[PDB]
Design a protein around this ligand. Sequence first.
Ligand SMILES: Cc1cc2nc3c(=O)[nH]c(=O)nc-3n(C[C@H](O)[C@H](O)[C@H](O)COP(=O)(O)OP(=O)(O)OC[C@H]3O[C@@H](n4cnc5c(N)ncnc54)[C@H](O)[C@@H]3O)c2cc1C
Ligand SMILES: C[C@@H](Oc1cc2onc(CCC(=O)O)c2cc1Cl)c1ccccn1
Length: 448
Amino acid sequence: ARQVTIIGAGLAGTLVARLLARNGWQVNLFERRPDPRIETGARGRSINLALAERGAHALRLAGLEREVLAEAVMMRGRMVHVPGTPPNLQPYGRDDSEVIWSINRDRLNRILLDGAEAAGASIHFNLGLDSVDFARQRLTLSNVSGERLEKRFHLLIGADGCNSAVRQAMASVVDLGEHLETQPHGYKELQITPEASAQFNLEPNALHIWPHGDYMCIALPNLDRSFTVTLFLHHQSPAAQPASPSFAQLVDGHAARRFFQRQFPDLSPMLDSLEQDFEHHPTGKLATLRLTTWHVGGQAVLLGDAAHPMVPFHGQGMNCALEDAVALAEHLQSAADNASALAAFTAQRQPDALAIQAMALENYVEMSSSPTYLLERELGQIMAQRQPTRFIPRYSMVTFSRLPYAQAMARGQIQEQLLKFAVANHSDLTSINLDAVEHEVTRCLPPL
Ligand SMILES: Cc1cc2nc3c(=O)[nH]c(=O)nc-3n(C[C@H](O)[C@H](O)[C@H](O)COP(=O)(O)OP(=O)(O)OC[C@H]3O[C@@H](n4cnc5c(N)ncnc54)[C@H](O)[C@@H]3O)c2cc1C
Ligand SMILES: C[C@@H](Oc1cc2onc(CCC(=O)O)c2cc1Cl)c1ccccn1
C-alpha cells in the first residue's frame, strides 16, 4: 500500500485523507490543534461558511454530502440591506436546486474527521509541523510546549492552510516564485442571537449584506436562527482619505458601537454583544498569494489555502479547496508515480486557482456598492431566458456548476463585454435589438 503523510486536518486535508484511505493508501494526518470532537468545557464561537456546488460535489463523491447538508441552512439568495428601503431578496438561482448552504465550520470538521477515520486514516492531533528535511525524508513536529517528534515520510501533502508550514519548508529547497498581494480590509466577527434575529424578522434562508462602499457587513445563518455577522473594514485609513473609517479608528467596543449606530443603523440593534465581540474577537487578515510552484518533485505538494490563499468575497476558498482534494486524490491514485501525479495535479489546478483568485477580488464591488448596470442586468436576464445553455451569469457558473474556474471567467468576460457593448449609447431596452445581441450570444458562447 502507498503511504502518505498529510499536514493539516482542515477541509482539504481531511477530504483527501478519506479519498486516499478508502483507496487503500496508508494515511497519517497531523494536525496542530486539539481534536474538536473531544468535548471540553471551553466556550466556542460559531463561524459559518457558504458551501456551494463545487464543495458539495466533492463531499458527494466522498459519501459525506447528506450528513453535511442535514446540518446546513439553505441560502436562497442575497438579502441587501440599505436604510430606507425594505430588505431586497435577490435569488441566487432559477429555483431551490440553485442555492448555497450555510454550514457551521466545527460541525463540518467533525463530519470530515469522522469520515477520514471511517475510511482508515490515522489522525494525530496537537502536533504542528515545524520543519522538513527533504533530502533525509524526515520531518519535525511539535506540540504547543515545543516537545519535538521526528517522523520519516514518503509523500507529504501540505493541507495546512494559508500560513502553511509545508509551503515555508518547500520555499527552502525550491524557489516557489511567491507573489503576496495584501488586501486592505480586516474582518471582525459579531453575533446575532436567535431572539434578536426573530425580533427584527431577519430572513434565515438568505445571505445578508449591508453594503457601505469601502466597508460592509454580511451575515450567515445558523440552524438555531443565530447569525454570524462579519464586518469587512480597512485596517488603516489611507493617506488620501485620513478621515475614512478603519479598525485603527475603533479604539474599543464603545467606538465600534457608535460606528455601527451611525453607519449600520438597522443592524446595530440586532448586535447585543457588539462591544464584547469587538474587543474579544481578533481582527482577521485577508490576502491573495500566488505561487509559481506547488510541488517538490514527487515528495511534497500543496493544496487548498496552503497553495492559493484568496480573498473571501466569492465564498469559494473552501469550495476550491475541496475541489482540489478530489483532483489531488484522483491524480495520486491513477498516476505512473507520485512525481507525475503532482506535476499533473499542479498543471491542472493552477490556471483555475488563478481564475478564482481574480474573480474573488472582483466580487467585492458586486457586494459592497447603479444606473447603466441595471440595464445590463435586464439584458442579461433576457439573454439567459432565450439561451439558458449559453448565457449563464458568472456567479451561477462559479457557484452552481463545476465548469473549470478559468472557463467560467473566460465565458463571464465574453458575457460582460457583450452586455457592456450592447447597452452603450442606449437609454433603455426598447432601443436595443434583442435578436442581434442573441446572435452574438450564439456566435461567441458555445452551449454547455
Ligand atoms: C471565518 C471564515 C469564513 C469563511 N467562509 C467561507 C465561505 O463562506 N465559503 C468558502 O468557500 N470559504 C470560506 N472561507 C475560506 C475557507 O475556510 C478556506 O479557504 C478553507 O478552510 C481552506 O481549506 P484548507 O483545508 O486548505 O485549510 P484549513 O481549512 O484552514 O485547514 C488547515 C489546517 O491545517 C492546520 N495547520 C496549520 N498549520 C499547521 C502546522 N504547522 N502543522 C499542522 N497543522 C497545521 C490548521 O489548524 C487547520 O486544521 C472562510 C474562511 C474564514 C477564515
Ligand atoms: C463568510 C465569509 O465571507 C463570505 C462568504 C460568502 O459566500 N458567498 C459569498 C458571495 C455572496 C454574494 O455575492 O452575494 C460570500 C462572500 C463573503 Cl465575504 C468569510 C468571512 C470571513 C473570512 C472569510 N470568509
